[PDB]
Amino acid sequence: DSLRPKLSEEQQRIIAILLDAHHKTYDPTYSDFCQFRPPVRVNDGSVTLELSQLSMLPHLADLVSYSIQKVIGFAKMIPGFRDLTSEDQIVLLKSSAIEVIMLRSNESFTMDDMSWTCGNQDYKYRVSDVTKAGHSLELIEPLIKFQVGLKKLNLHEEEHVLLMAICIVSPDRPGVQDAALIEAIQDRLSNTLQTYIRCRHPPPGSHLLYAKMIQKLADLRSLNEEHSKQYRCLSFQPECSMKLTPLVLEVFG
Ligand SMILES: C[C@@H]1[C@H](O)C=C(C#CC2=CCC[C@@]3(C)[C@@H]2CC[C@@H]3[C@H](C)CCCC(C)(C)O)C[C@H]1O
């Protein structure tokens, strides 16, 4: 009884652009990782030791800064993002940066051992590594829950890039000027996503995937708020900005 409208020429183009944007901004071999400040793993088996050392912070801060640069690159290739004022472009990028990083990290996340595997042994990131970077389990546990839940959706790469774009272009972000434009750009992306699922995703017996995808966006909202709280506490540690990057400092500070 549910209508299945075909993907329009513009919608097929939008997907093509977004897939191409992602392949230009996501290296699945993670060959740049060795250029970061080296990962250090001291035995913790302690929140006092954690903040004392912050051993994994320089590496992960470089990982996040690098990721932010890629997201910016990805955003500029999103259809519509061009038409926005640069002031609205920054607003959207700053408030969605950590959300989109959590999204795009799912391509490296594996349910083999519940880790982010970016090769090879050194660049395998477990729960203990994130703690060693000065974050508590209040963020880390729900983050893994999110990643696992997202993995089980078995998203097509077409859906994965669309979801990242919808995430970035959000009219309900604190500080937006032209919310109607952002809403129009998001509607264009959402409609393409809704059409694609009904068209391309099998069987389809339960097209209830879209509602599950919108739920993931809300999961990101609360994760964003929790990371924000924990970042503020990390920044209280003396000589902490040293371990971060000017870009990470601007986005979260
Ligand atoms: C490069 C690809 C993608 O961009 C993200 C990846 C990742 C990852 C991550 C692996 C371990 C946890 C993270 C460090 C990131 C993603 C978000 C996590 C935390 C909460 C961010 C903390 C930031 C700060 C220390 C400044 O507070 C791997 C690849 O899939």
Side-chain angles (χ1 to χ4, degrees):
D1 203 14
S2 302
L3 275 165
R4 278 178 51 158
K6 294 163 182 168
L7 281 162
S8 66
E9 300 84 287
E10 188 177 323
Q11 282 168 332
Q12 290 177 348
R13 175 187 156 83
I14 284 164
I15 296 159
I17 291 167
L18 291 179
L19 280 165
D20 187 63
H22 184 63
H23 299 137
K24 282 177 176 176
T25 56
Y26 195 106
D27 174 19
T29 70
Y30 315 101
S31 57
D32 287 330
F33 279 47
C34 54
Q35 296 181 55
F36 304 150
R37 287 175 286 173
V40 172
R41 287 164 180 97
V42 287
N43 40 260
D44 58 347
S46 177
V47 191
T48 301
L49 217 210
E50 228 88 282
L51 298 168
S52 178
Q53 303 279 43
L54 294 175
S55 61
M56 279 297 296
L57 187 57
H59 181 76
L60 294 182
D62 279 359
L63 169 57
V64 168
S65 195
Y66 169 95
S67 300
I68 293 167
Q69 292 188 70
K70 298 297 174 191
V71 170
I72 290 161
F74 178 78
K76 291 184 75 73
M77 278 178 280
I78 298 172
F81 195 82
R82 216 95 258 272
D83 307 284
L84 295 169
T85 63
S86 76
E87 199 169 347
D88 265 348
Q89 290 182 36
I90 307 156
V91 164
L92 294 175
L93 278 162
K94 282 184 167 188
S95 52
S96 68
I98 197 67
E99 285 178 38
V100 183
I101 290 159
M102 287 171 181
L103 262 169
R104 75 200 308 268
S105 75
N106 203 245
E107 206 174 320
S108 73
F109 191 80
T110 176
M111 281 167 72
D112 289 334
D113 55 342
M114 307 300 169
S115 65
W116 288 271
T117 305
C118 310
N120 43 324
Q121 220 80 299
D122 301 40
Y123 315 123
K124 194 191 280 287
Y125 317 106
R126 284 146 254 86
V127 173
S128 59
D129 287 327
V130 195
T131 61
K132 270 187 265 284
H135 283 289
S136 78
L137 280 86
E138 283 89 308
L139 168 74
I140 309 163
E141 283 194 6
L143 177 51
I144 304 289
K145 259 82 166 182
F146 170 83
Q147 298 296 326
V148 169
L150 190 64
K151 270 274 153 153
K152 293 192 90 73
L153 294 181
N154 300 290
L155 297 177
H156 295 187
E157 195 168 52
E158 293 91 344
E159 290 161 353
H160 176 71
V161 300
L162 270 161
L163 189 58
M164 286 187 291
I166 289 158
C167 179
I168 294 162
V169 196
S170 300
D172 51 290
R173 292 283 195 194
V176 295
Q177 255 281 298
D178 195 349
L181 223 188
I182 304 162
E183 193 175 25
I185 303 161
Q186 190 178 63
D187 279 16
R188 201 161 70 183
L189 294 162
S190 297
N191 296 333
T192 311
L193 183 68
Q194 296 189 248
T195 311
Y196 180 91
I197 294 160
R198 290 193 189 272
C199 279
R200 297 278 150 87
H201 209 110
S206 61
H207 63 280
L208 218 67
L209 174 63
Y210 178 72
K212 288 170 173 172
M213 290 179 77
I214 296 303
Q215 189 46 236
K216 294 298 169 184
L217 291 180
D219 295 344
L220 259 2
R221 297 270 167 164
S222 52
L223 281 168
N224 198 339
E225 226 302 88
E226 180 57 45
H227 176 265
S228 191
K229 284 189 183 175
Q230 287 194 20
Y231 184 86
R232 251 157 22 148
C233 291
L234 252 174
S235 59
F236 292 152
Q237 200 64 220
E239 306 279 340
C240 184
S241 66
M242 157 225 188
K243 289 163 178 59
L244 307 164
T245 71
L247 178 60
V248 169
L249 283 162
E250 199 224 354
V251 166
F252 305 115

